[PDB]
Design an enzyme around this catalytic site. Structure first.
Site, short mmCIF file in Angstrom:
data_model
loop_
_atom_site.label_atom_id
_atom_site.label_comp_id
_atom_site.label_asym_id
_atom_site.label_seq_id
_atom_site.Cartn_x
_atom_site.Cartn_y
_atom_site.Cartn_z
CG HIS C 10 -0.65 -0.51 2.47
ND1 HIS C 10 -0.57 -1.81 2.59
CD2 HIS C 10 -0.61 0.22 3.59
CE1 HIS C 10 -0.04 -2.02 3.82
NE2 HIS C 10 -0.18 -0.81 4.53
CG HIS C 101 29.13 -10.81 -5.25
ND1 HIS C 101 29.00 -9.75 -4.43
CD2 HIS C 101 30.41 -10.91 -5.82
CE1 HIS C 101 30.06 -9.28 -4.49
NE2 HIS C 101 31.13 -9.70 -5.32
NE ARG C 136 34.87 -15.18 -5.60
CZ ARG C 136 35.14 -14.48 -6.69
NH1 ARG C 136 35.59 -15.10 -8.04
NH2 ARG C 136 35.18 -13.34 -6.58
#
Lengths: 152, 153, 152, 153
Positions: C10, C101, C136
């Site tokens: 809202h 990332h 990674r």
């Protein structure tokens, strides 16, 4: 009675009623004195920074609140007035520290950067948090005054 | 034709002074860091180092200044007491950019205890790389800041 | 075409037109799909977080934008949907990192905490910043999927 | 009758794990830190430590969790994948307080590379000290989060 002068630029005019309320929310002893623009039309921030800063410097009011786009210009302009220690704050921590460490007398905020509920928190924290009065902080504040004196 | 950038800190921010030097260099090969902060971790008063850097900017010995302390608040207050200085306490990319675009800021202030080092890095790079807009209204407002200085000189 | 589903609660309804514009500002290829409330009346954030998150998870749209009071509730609720990586961002750095990332697919913001110009910067940065694709990060994202699988 | 608080980090935030333990203790004598992060500075994957702490919260072995990483974003995403967890990425006092008041959050996430340590301290203390409002609308919304979990179980 602890008087608090309020100034804004054009974009922050939309929240000037907010700022007045937030000062009052800090406590019954805090009295807002609105010194900002009366309309939403374009103004120059240094004109309003100067008005509020002079009031603080002359001991007319205890505190000032300056709200603008980023608050950067407000903080720069206000600090040009001898006796003013104006703190651009973006959160509770900076609001509190500005008082505890710097005995700041003007709080600056950015309406385009900081949400209004955080602005509320900043103003209340700024007004309610006392200066520590610790030796090193008093000394550093005196050194700020000495910088002022060397350029007067 | 390179641009000199004076760097000062208080005692806690001394731990990241090598960071600050690197970040200035990361902004570009044209930016030359000039370290003017404390050489040791011994306790110091921020206004002394704010003044040192601010005076260098005001005298035009360097183009920019970088001041890092606990919160950055004291640094910004003290540096702005020097005529000709426009010192901006920044906490993010947006404030870093707008300090240059709108205020033609010449000193950036940061808090080591408030702002993480990677955001400090971003702030410094953004501050140095972002040009002043030169737009009519900003020029006028900066001149009004100068007028405030003159009225108290 | 890169579709971006938008949801709000809202209070953030007041800026839903802002959010639509900011998505478009990221580039011509970015297409906002508004899926938030049609009025300013009180709603429950999880209902709108769920709507947008399901669209992202089912590959109906590439990205989501969720704006609410603080953005905290939005981020919690959206992340309950398998396949969603929802990032509560408060600045440019977090917006960029969430993509670099985490290959985040939903950005969450707080209208009461973060000023609209910073919200604009967050949305544009989020949509324009590519995922690094580094070994990674890919591995860690796979591990998030594995946590999902273990509870399904 | 004390309240247990599980703590996890990634590799960079390991440098401040002793900070995190202290900050939990600073919230009050009733808060007991339970350190579950990496014991060394060796490289780790955040989801592994997010999961460890999140599972402890979900199983009610502890009341609260604290997760610190680079940005905190990955931690918040991974922790929220565990049913029963409400993990809040916080960057200031306001978000820390509202995560509890509105969301009855049970895990606080922070970014070591984004947020200065004194603000991390404030966030942790505020998070632990601030009670949940218990207000009707907040209870309803939290139940709706639980319903989303159940639909994908």
């Amino acid at each position: 009675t602890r008087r608090v002068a309020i100034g804004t630029d054009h974009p922050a005019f939309a929240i000037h009623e907010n700022l007045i309320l937030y000062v009052k929310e800090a406590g019954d002893e805090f009295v807002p004195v609105y010194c900002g623009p009366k309309t939403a039309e374009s103004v120059d921030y240094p004109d309003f920074a100067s008005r509020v800063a002079e009031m603080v410097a002359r001991k007319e009011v205890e505190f000032g609140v300056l709200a603008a786009g980023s608050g950067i210009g407000m903080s720069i302009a206000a600090n040009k007035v001898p006796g003013v220690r104006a703190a651009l704050c973006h959160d509770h921590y900076t609001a509190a520290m500005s008082r505890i460490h710097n005995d700041a007398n003007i709080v600056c905020v950015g309406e385009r950067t900081t949400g209004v509920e955080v602005i509320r928190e900043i103003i209340i924290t700024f007004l309610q948090t006392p200066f520590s009065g610790e030796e090193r902080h008093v000394r550093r504040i005196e050194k700020i005054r000495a910088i002022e004196a060397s350029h007067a």
